[PDB]
Amino acid sequence: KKIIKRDYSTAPFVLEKITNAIANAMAALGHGSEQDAKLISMQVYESLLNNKEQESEYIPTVEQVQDMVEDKLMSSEFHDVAKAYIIYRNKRALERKTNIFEKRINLKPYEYPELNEYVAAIRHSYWIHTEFNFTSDIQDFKTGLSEVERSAIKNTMLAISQIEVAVKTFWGDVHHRLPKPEIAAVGATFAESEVRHHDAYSHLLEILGLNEEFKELKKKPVIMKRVHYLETSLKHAKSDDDREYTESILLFALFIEHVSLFSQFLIIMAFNKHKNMLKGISNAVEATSKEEQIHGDFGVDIINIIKKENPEWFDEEHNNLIKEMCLNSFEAESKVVDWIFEKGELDFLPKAVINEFLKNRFNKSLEAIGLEKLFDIDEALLQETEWFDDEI
Amino acid sequence: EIKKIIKRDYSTAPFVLEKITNAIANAMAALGHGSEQDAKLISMQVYESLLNNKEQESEYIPTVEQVQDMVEDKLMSSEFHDVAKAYIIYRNKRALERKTNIFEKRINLKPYEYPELNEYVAAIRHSYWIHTEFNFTSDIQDFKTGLSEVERSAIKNTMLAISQIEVAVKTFWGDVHHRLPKPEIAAVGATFAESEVRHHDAYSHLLEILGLNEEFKELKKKPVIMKRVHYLETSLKHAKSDDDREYTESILLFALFIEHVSLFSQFLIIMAFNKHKNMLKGISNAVEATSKEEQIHGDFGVDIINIIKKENPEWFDEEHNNLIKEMCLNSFEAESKVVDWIFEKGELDFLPKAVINEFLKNRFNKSLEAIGLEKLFDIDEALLQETEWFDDEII
Amino acid sequence: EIKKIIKRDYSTAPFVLEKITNAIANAMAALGHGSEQDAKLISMQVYESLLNNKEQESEYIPTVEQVQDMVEDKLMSSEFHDVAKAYIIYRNKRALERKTNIFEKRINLKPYEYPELNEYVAAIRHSYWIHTEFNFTSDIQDFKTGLSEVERSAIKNTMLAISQIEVAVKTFWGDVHHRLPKPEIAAVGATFAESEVRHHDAYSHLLEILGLNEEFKELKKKPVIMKRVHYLETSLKHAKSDDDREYTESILLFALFIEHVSLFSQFLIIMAFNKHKNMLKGISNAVEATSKEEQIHGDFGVDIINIIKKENPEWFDEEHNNLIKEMCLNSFEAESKVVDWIFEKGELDFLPKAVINEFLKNRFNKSLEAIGLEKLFDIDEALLQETEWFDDEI
Amino acid sequence: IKKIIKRDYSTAPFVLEKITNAIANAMAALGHGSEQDAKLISMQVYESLLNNKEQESEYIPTVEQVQDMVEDKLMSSEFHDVAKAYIIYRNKRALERKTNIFEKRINLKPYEYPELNEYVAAIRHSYWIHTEFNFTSDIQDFKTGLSEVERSAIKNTMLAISQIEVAVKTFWGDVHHRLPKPEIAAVGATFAESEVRHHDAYSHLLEILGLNEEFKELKKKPVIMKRVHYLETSLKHAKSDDDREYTESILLFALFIEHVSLFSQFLIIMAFNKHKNMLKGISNAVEATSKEEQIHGDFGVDIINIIKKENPEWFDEEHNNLIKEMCLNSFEAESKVVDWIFEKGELDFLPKAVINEFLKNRFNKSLEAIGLEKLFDIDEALLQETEWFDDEI
Ligand SMILES: Nc1ncnc2c1ncn2[C@H]1C[C@H](O)[C@@H](COP(=O)(O)OP(=O)(O)OP(=O)(O)O)O1
Ligand SMILES: Nc1ncnc2c1ncn2[C@H]1C[C@H](O)[C@@H](COP(=O)(O)OP(=O)(O)OP(=O)(O)O)O1
Ligand SMILES: Nc1ncnc2c1ncn2[C@H]1C[C@H](O)[C@@H](COP(=O)(O)OP(=O)(O)OP(=O)(O)O)O1
Ligand SMILES: Nc1ncnc2c1ncn2[C@H]1C[C@H](O)[C@@H](COP(=O)(O)OP(=O)(O)OP(=O)(O)O)O1
Ligand SMILES: Nc1ncnc2c1ncn2[C@H]1C[C@H](O)[C@@H](COP(=O)(O)OP(=O)(O)OP(=O)(O)O)O1
Ligand SMILES: Nc1ncnc2c1ncn2[C@H]1C[C@H](O)[C@@H](COP(=O)(O)OP(=O)(O)OP(=O)(O)O)O1
Ligand SMILES: Nc1ncnc2c1ncn2[C@H]1C[C@H](O)[C@@H](COP(=O)(O)OP(=O)(O)OP(=O)(O)O)O1
Ligand SMILES: Nc1ncnc2c1ncn2[C@H]1C[C@H](O)[C@@H](COP(=O)(O)OP(=O)(O)OP(=O)(O)O)O1
Ligand SMILES: [Mg+2]
Ligand SMILES: [Mg+2]
Ligand SMILES: [Mg+2]
Ligand SMILES: [Mg+2]
Ligand SMILES: [Mn+2]
Ligand SMILES: [Mn+2]
Ligand SMILES: [Mn+2]
Ligand SMILES: [Mn+2]
Ligand SMILES: [Mn+2]
Ligand SMILES: [Mn+2]
Ligand SMILES: [Mn+2]
Ligand SMILES: [Mn+2]
């Protein structure tokens, strides 16, 4: 009575669909007739009937029906039709496969409609800094935070602005190498969120009087070693080779988007969760974290589409490079944290707790692709930042 | 005496003789020929000649460049000939370095070379909308049962015409930073690019809910649409060119004619329909929001063209102005034919083709005039006044 | 009774039944259905059906593909249906992988995919020439105290027209390996590129010694030349394109019309002069040497197009074929105008424009026919016969 | 004043009318002054030049000294506007006369670097095909005439040459993309075709010597993998879109790859024929390849010196330490290739010590050619043993 289609949907069983598929294979070779096709269809039907005998819960698949058609054509006089059927079916199956790097003729239907959720995610998360009030935050600096706390916040703000207050064009340019309408939609939507993040942190540098301090940040050794791993990771961002460009997406989504700013997002939101201070800045950092989580997630999905389509590319040589880069990302981010707390650590958020938080983020990134974790974790120290992931 | 000076930016400032002395002293120090005492002597000569021009002849304010020309003249009249020559060369080199090039990348993020362009990001953030904010329930009812066959055919054709531009992959603005590598331009491009994602989603939804998906796939086979695709593709011929001059022609025709005129006859039809018949409420709200964002898109293009013209005036000769004028006529011919096709089953009493055609002719003239070019069409101000309400709702 | 087999490379080899047995056993091993014993039984059936063909043919020799079709047929007739299906798919997959793609890079240097293309390197090594090998002394004497004003104007214009193409930077052949990344194509590219340096140096020297350097700088302003530059640039529109189908149009128009027809009216004019008037002995020698090298250049391009057509037949539709025929006519119109300009001061009695025009029309038809297209020009066989000596000199 | 030094440093007869006309043209351009005024200014320039000659040090004026003098007299005169316009026009003409190797140009002629045309003439002169040589004697020398030690050394030397030569080589043929000059395009295309000839020659030698199978397996040898590593590192930026990165590739390629990588192997084959009077055919082919490799590296040295002269800022201590670092890595790997060639034993007439000094010296000459200091200490006695090699080339 029913059939499971290729898209896993159920549809009413129509024997004429089997008859016509056989008749078309027959017509293509000039061997057989509508009468012969009807006979073969019945043989296929009688066989399906016998499968409902072994199991009452059985409903045939389109691929099970196809395998059966082929088997009956091999058992018949129409061997040339059987061979042509096998080849034709296999050719259509190969044509139905997707290539993320290849352009398509038609706009609709989408090849990866699940990616449309990323446009909806950013439209939901959409924010402008002008929606927040930084008045309490300015006062927290004037008459509520200690020299040690104010140095840590200043350094954290500067570290976020290093990445955020810049020209960011990776997502906006992703459609040049992944030429899909659904990816272009995501790319454009993410590019604009990067304009909003720039405007937020550029405003915060202004109102906090950190503009001069920001221009001189590039000359700091800790920042130069950070710029070095960031630029190394984006080495192939403009490459014409699809495998080289995949390395850029990988390191960018997994480590840049998902770990580079989160030691800093943690610090600002720690001050707020703990002391109920930095209200406006915390709101802006939380909204950034939410959009950064969406950015990294899309990258993880893109990598998994690439891996599924080109599994050969993901060998031991590739996996050792990712693990090499992951460690260099950690060592550089750990030294950024050391610089943030140059004037002293915070009793409520020590460097040890921040370092476990980073190590874990890097492991989750590795695990998201299908790689084994790189760091051993102190579960007790990690539990101290469980509140962060509950809020994002 | 001399109390004021006109600066390079044409602003006025109090006259300070030490500024002339220091400029001369620095030229002298660079060569090791002359002293502050000699510089002071030359400054006075410059000052005395500046007075001879003022109260003595026409009651003027000297310019920084008139001062510079005078410094050079006194240096040549003095013993410091090597200083005179070095001053001439340094001044000219500083003049060249001071120029902005929209096509060249700059070293530092701040200061911005074109900070006026930042207003376009603010404009789109203000005009920002998603179709999910509107309710198209009444519109679906109007279209399926509430419209006459003449009205329905016109609306269907208008919707299809908007969708052949809007329901497509649009990456021009998102890619503008490749040839115009400025942070402030990159910000505008990204914001405009996302606005096109929203425009696509809106008209794609409208094709779905109005049951026009099948008529949309078959639209490409229509002669009027093929003729439209032809001028649109001709206009974007150099959109991916590596020559800055060729690429400028693409920005020009795209901003001035594609962004400012191609969809506006259709935008006018939907607006006039709601205005007179109080129908197509949701679609009207969506068309109005698209019109506002298209006006912003074309405006940015106009500004970009005027920056390019100011920096490369040689590129904008009579041969290139005749090409724009010709393409403007081809854009009008094709859009006028689109309007004829929209009203194939009959014209609307409240909005005749004659009123639509004057509205288009005027939009094309404003585009030409916005770029310092001569108007192309002669306008009947009476037929044009019938669509004045449209420019009220967009501004 | 079956002693030989035709292999895939069309070579004949002794028939070995164990080769059939092992192919069946590998398909059987891959699925875990059957045994070596079952494979030998299927082999015997295959051998038996091959003999039935020998009964009907005569000295029937099976091909590897006929043996393959037979293996499949016996597997379908047997209990091993899964093995028959897997054999069909594997054989077909292996055949698809064996196909060549001119635009794709290969892993190994040897074996060559197109070894016939190596002949072009040998062809140029044979035709290789430097202008310094010829003597232009008699030519300088002819060009002053030997030619009439009509003859001298024609020669100067012919030389200038040749130089319009030859005295320039030519990098198409040298850059062909970027889009057709084959070692054998890279060899031809480099060899053809150097020949262009030799062609440039030749015509640049002739402009110097004939005192045509000033006339050459002001040739670009001539309407006939601007019209020529227009079709030449249109033809090379996609020469640096990143799309393989667009780039193929550039190779096509370039090899077929630019290389094989653009300079040939001029080559014919100079040759005619040495043949009939017995003059310009040095210049005729260089022109003949260039003609032979241009014929080699266009020929390689024709071979490249035929490889592309064989591999992507879908690309060569009616829309494509109408563009080639459109461009072929524009090439002819522009070249016919060039001939009119060469003879602005008067035609030559031994070589009239009508004879030159039939010569061109025919060259364009041969180009079209070389890539399997229809002959586009109406030919006066009598007027054409007047220049058959040229082709009987390349 | 009888003669003047021109911009190209050539001497020419002094003509005062050349000064008069330059002044008159500056005057004519503004409509300020006359030929009479130009003549007066010319004389002032002449008189001041005369003051530096007969009266001072028997000097010869240069075009730029005459130009500075013209400007000085114009500044001393009433024509301050033409004095200024002269200064600007002279400086504009001087800026236009500057060359940028990375930039295109409107006109084919005149050439910016006409000295580079000599490289096309050099290759046309050195042009050869392997079909011109007779390898009959060589084939038998290899099968039956060589000892086990000698045979192994020749086989390894041939395989080492072929590692570089039997391959697709497109660097020179692609140089015009980043150095877009007609004169560079001419050398590049000429050099690219010579590499096709080199490929055909060593591919034929692998065939006739029965080394095709040993060649396919050569890639798996640790010494060869180590060699491929420095060669690929050196050509890291060969396809880069940055002019400074691409310059590093040209540098390492011309100086070390072209001028040194194959020269130990070229020396082995030459020395063998010289001493043993065997491998006459192969020696002829090797000598012809050595001659064309010397031309290839020389053009590269000239290109680097043009780049250095135009962008001196690029050649700092950080850059120079990288070249010296890469030069040592090239030497280490090449010396390892020498050890592998003689794995079955050294040659009495050509020991590894003599080959190693020969290499060290070649690397020093490369460094010195682009104005860098040497790196290796040389044993002049061991080096003298290979002076015949440089005489042959
Ligand atoms: N509803 C059905 N009832 C019975 N057999 C079916 C049905 N749908 C598909 N099949 C089987 C018959 C053939 O063996 C095979 C392919 O048939 P076909 O008519 O092309 O449908 P389909 O599943 O490929 O979808 P589509 O209509 O989009 O091509 O699947
Ligand atoms: N020309 C033919 N030669 C051989 N078999 C054929 C031919 N035409 C149809 N068939 C058979 C084999 C196919 O699996 C079956 C259904 O046909 P068809 O709908 O065209 O393809 P399909 O179901 O395999 O894939 P798809 O739905 O992606 O088009 O009919
Ligand atoms: N206020 C002034 N009073 C008199 N002369 C002035 C004044 N400002 C500028 N000048 C003249 C003096 C010199 O000839 C020439 C350049 O002087 P300078 O001190 O560099 O100022 P400026 O106009 O270039 O501004 P800036 O501070 O941006 O360099 O302009
Ligand atoms: N090093 C120098 N050599 C020669 N002339 C000099 C030098 N320094 C200063 N001068 C002269 C010429 C300059 O036009 C003038 C003012 O100097 P400066 O402010 O540095 O340049 P400027 O006003 O022309 O341009 P800008 O202010 O835009 O950099 O003084
Ligand atoms: N000499 C032969 N005698 C009989 N059958 C043969 C012979 N050579 C090939 N075949 C048939 C047997 C199989 O059906 C089919 C493929 O067999 P196979 O052993 O792979 O040889 P081949 O022709 O593909 O060459 P290769 O050894 O390079 O793979 O061809
Ligand atoms: N793994 C297998 N699954 C199914 N059939 C197989 C398998 N291995 C061998 N065969 C069958 C089908 C092949 O055509 C035949 C000969 O095998 P094979 O030499 O590997 O391929 P082939 O001769 O078709 O192509 P080629 O020689 O070019 O690789 O044996
Ligand atoms: N032979 C000469 N005798 C005297 N002055 C000369 C001579 N040649 C050049 N000069 C001086 C005069 C002017 O100041 C300056 C430029 O003069 P000019 O006539 O343009 O010659 P040149 O050196 O630039 O060569 P060219 O003829 O190629 O332009 O050089
Ligand atoms: N139009 C002019 N305006 C100002 N000075 C001029 C003009 N024409 C000639 N002169 C002066 C300045 C020049 O240096 C000099 C010689 O003229 P010219 O040969 O044209 O340039 P040049 O010798 O400096 O460079 P070049 O040889 O590269 O052309 O005469
Ligand atoms: Mg189907
Ligand atoms: Mg200044
Ligand atoms: Mg096989
Ligand atoms: Mg001159
Ligand atoms: Mn961000
Ligand atoms: Mn981000
Ligand atoms: Mn839009
Ligand atoms: Mn728009
Ligand atoms: Mn040629
Ligand atoms: Mn040619
Ligand atoms: Mn070589
Ligand atoms: Mn070389």
Residue numbers in the entry:
A (entry chain B): 7 to 398
B (entry chain A): 5 to 399
C (entry chain C): 5 to 398
D (entry chain D): 6 to 398
Paper text:
RNRs are essential enzymes in all free-living cells, providing the only known de novo pathway for the biosynthesis of deoxyribonucleotides (dNTPs), the immediate precursors for DNA synthesis and repair. Class I RNRs consist of a large, catalytic subunit (α or NrdA), and a smaller, radical-generating subunit (β or NrdB). Additionally, many RNRs possess an overall activity regulation site (a-site) positioned in an N-terminal domain of ~85–100 amino acid residues called the ATP-cone. L. blandensis possesses two RNRs: a class II without ATP-cone, and the class I NrdAi/NrdBi, which lacks an ATP-cone in NrdA and instead contains an ATP-cone positioned at the N-terminus of NrdB.
Binding of dATP to the ATP-cone instead promoted oligomerization of L. blandensis NrdBi to an inactive β4 complex, with a novel tetrameric structure revealed by crystallography. Each monomer consists of an ATP-cone domain (residues 1–103) joined by a short linker (104-106) to a metal-binding α-helical core domain (residues 107–398) and a disordered C-terminus (399-427). The tetrameric arrangement is completely dependent on interactions between the ATP cone domains, as no contacts are made between the core domains in the two dimers that make up the tetramer. The electron density unambiguously confirms the L. blandensis ATP-cone’s ability to bind two molecules of dATP, which it shares with P. aeruginosa NrdA. The two dATP molecules bind in a ‘tail-to-tail’ arrangement that orients the base of the ‘non-canonical’ dATP towards the fourth, most C-terminal helix, an arrangement made possible by the binding of a Mg2+ ion between the triphosphate moieties. The main interactions occur between the last two helices α3 and α4 in respective ATP-cones. A hydrophobic core in L. blandensis NrdB involving residues Met80, Ile92 and Ile93 in both monomers is reinforced by salt bridges between residues Asp73, Asp76 in one monomer and Lys89 in the other. Interestingly, the dATP-induced tetramer leaves free the surfaces of both dimers of L. blandensis NrdB that are thought to interact with the NrdA subunit in productive RNR complexes, which implies that one or two dimers of L. blandensis NrdA could attach to these surfaces in a near-productive fashion in α2β4 or α4β4 complexes. Two metal ions are found to bind to each of the monomers of L. blandensis NrdB. Interestingly, Tyr207 is found near the metal site at the position expected for a radical-carrying Tyr, but it is not hydrogen-bonded to the metal site, its hydroxyl group being at around 6 Å from the side chain of Glu170.
